Design a protein around this nucleic acid. Structure first.
Lengths: 92, 91, 92, 88
DNA sequence: AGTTCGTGACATTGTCACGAACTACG
DNA sequence: CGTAGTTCGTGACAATGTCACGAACT
């Protein structure tokens, strides 16, 4: 297939989401989509994936739907965070 | 395209390739594979992209073909690798 | 063995084989055969006798397996080429 | 596994013997050129078949001798044996 | 729709492998 | 005439890139 992106070269969109929900604590698709630059419907059906393999849980707190990291969602967040930090100690 | 799959959660293959291309200077399309654990045919497909856009070129070595980040292809590297630092740092 | 036929009259294949390598230094069965005009299944073969003896040794450029001549192997060619050179001076 | 024939063919040794000796018998050639009788006569049969050598029989005395075209090959080819050893 | 992993089906050279034809030499 | 040692074509295999697919992401 054809490669052509100028958006997600090194970084996956699936990535920003994680790093976002890390110190925002919790959030929803609505604001994630313009804090982290990443388009809204590229956001949600990707969230469903995290929801699916147990990385995000759901809290309609009232009239809304709130997204969160769960603890295996966090147990990998850190697990990859270091793997990716480590490909950086080689080129500096 | 499909950038995010179940094992390229954080980084694309285009990441590991150029990262590895820096530690040896040059590795083959095939050589890269058992070192970045990326499936071989996935590697080549990005490889052709890398030279059409001019990031890398096929440096001839007898019968075998070698591959080099061009000066062009390190400008992206040190640039893209900066974007990830502004993220996995505020941790 | 099958040492001589129609166009194999004075010099064996090993003749140009060990000589080839002297002239250049190191080559594949590919490079050898293409120049010494010896069919490859003959180049490959004589080479095994060379390696399994101790005249020639392998030399891989990753997956490019060149063949270099050793010590007793070309200190042989020299010793041996005169058992040639003087059986020919009776012809000038 | 080869022993004394590593660069020069046995057939070679023979073809040069009939140069300075001109006329020759198998056993004649066999003894001095250092080759078991069987190989001598056999490679000779090839040479005569290819039109390179000729039997010369005087009694029950068979003397093989190198023909002209047998000599013409030995020349044009000794020249290539040469350019082999010269390239050092 | 456009994109893009990554298996699978091709069209290549480089080296070992079985088999045919013949030479070396008792 | 017979066993041994050989020259080679054809065949079986392992290692690159292309070609074309199916499948899921943007």
């Amino acid at each position: 297939g054809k490669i052509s992106t100028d958006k997600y070269i090194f970084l996956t969109p699936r990535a920003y989401i994680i790093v976002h929900l890390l110190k925002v604590g919790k959030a929803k698709a609505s604001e994630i989509s313009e804090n982290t630059q990443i388009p809204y419907q590229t956001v949600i059906q990707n969230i469903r994936w995290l929801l699916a393999e147990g990385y995000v849980v759901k809290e309609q707190k009232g009239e809304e739907i709130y997204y969160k990291l769960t603890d295996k969602g966090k147990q990998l967040a850190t697990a990859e965070l270091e793997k990716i930090r480590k490909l950086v100690e080689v080129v500096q």
